[PDB]
Amino acid sequence: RKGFKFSTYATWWIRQAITRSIADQARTIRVPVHMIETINKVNRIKRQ
DNA sequence: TACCTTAATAACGCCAATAACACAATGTTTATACAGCTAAAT
């Protein structure tokens, strides 16, 4: 009904799924996704 | 590579009850004696 390309709607869902999969199976020991995101933000701040 | 929200999970606090400590107190146990009894003595 809205006039827009479907690629962006598909892209957001694909990106969310990939990030979630990486966090869930990223390490042999399961680590919380919220804990992982804060660690990623801290690492980016340290790099800057 | 955001947030959070709320909710929920899980920790935690608090509170009963309580078994166990604890002492008490006696009545027992124990030891005691000292004692009239007894063995030996004489």
Side-chain angles (χ1 to χ4, degrees), chain A residues 7-8 10-41:
Chain A
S7 313
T8 43
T11 344
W12 277 84
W13 299 83
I14 314 294
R15 184 173 293 184
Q16 290 298 39
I18 192 45
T19 182
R20 189 157 313 283
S21 302
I22 295 289
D24 158 305
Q25 17 216 11
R27 302 164 156 79
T28 49
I29 301 182
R30 192 176 174 279
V31 45
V33 183
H34 78 272
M35 185 76 64
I36 219 64
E37 46 94 325
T38 180
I39 299 179
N40 303 330
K41 165 182 47 186

